[model samples]
Target chain A: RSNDSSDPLVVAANIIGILHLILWILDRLFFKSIYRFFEHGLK
Target chain B: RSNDSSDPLVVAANIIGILHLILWILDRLFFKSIYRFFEHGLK
Candidate 1:
């Protein structure tokens, strides 16, 4: 199976990508210092 | 890029990944703990 803009997979991917991008940017911009203790928990 | 049904990235690569899958699961399970960032803004 392939995913394009019309494909559900693509749509799902796009949504999650955007969501993560938002979270990442927010974490970097306003929450980095306090978030560091929490960030590497994943990394 | 290239995507195929068998490709890991193609499967849900752009969408949610194995790591994020765990995060999403934890987020859903933890409920309000997730909104801790966007909600109070360190209030």
Candidate 2:
């Protein structure tokens, strides 16, 4: 096991990656309203 | 701008990416203590 200050950076990357993934899940889950907001109207 | 259902995914990705980035800044700012949590001890 290697060790150094850079270890914290690795840990940060891992957690942020998780944040991105789970938030992606939640976004896909129920945030379709962001769709209509972007497209500029409802059909 | 090209429009499609996948557009929402891009928007979600963009927003979540921002979340991860800003949170990373916060973590780096005040959470070096996450280091102690992992290392299991204080120096």
TM-score to native of every candidate shown:
0.38, 0.33
Model 2's alpha-carbon lDDT is: 0.57
Q: Model 2 segments beyond 4 Å from truth?
A: A1-43, B1-6, B40-43
Error of model 2, residue B40, in angstroms: 4.9
Candidate 2, pairs of clashing residues: none
Which 10-residue window of candidate 1 chain A scores lowest in summed lDDT?
A30-39
Weakest 10 consecutive residues, lDDT, candidate 2 chain A? A28-37
lDDT of 1 by residue, B1-43 (tens): 5854444556556644646756854653453444444556656
lDDT of 2 at B26: 66
Q: Candidate 2: count the clashes.
A: 0
lDDT score of residue B22 within candidate 2: 73
**Per-candidate DockQ versus the true complex?**
0.16, 0.02
- lDDT tens per residue, model 2, A1-43: 5743324455566556767767754643463343444556565
Chain B TM, every candidate: 0.34, 0.51
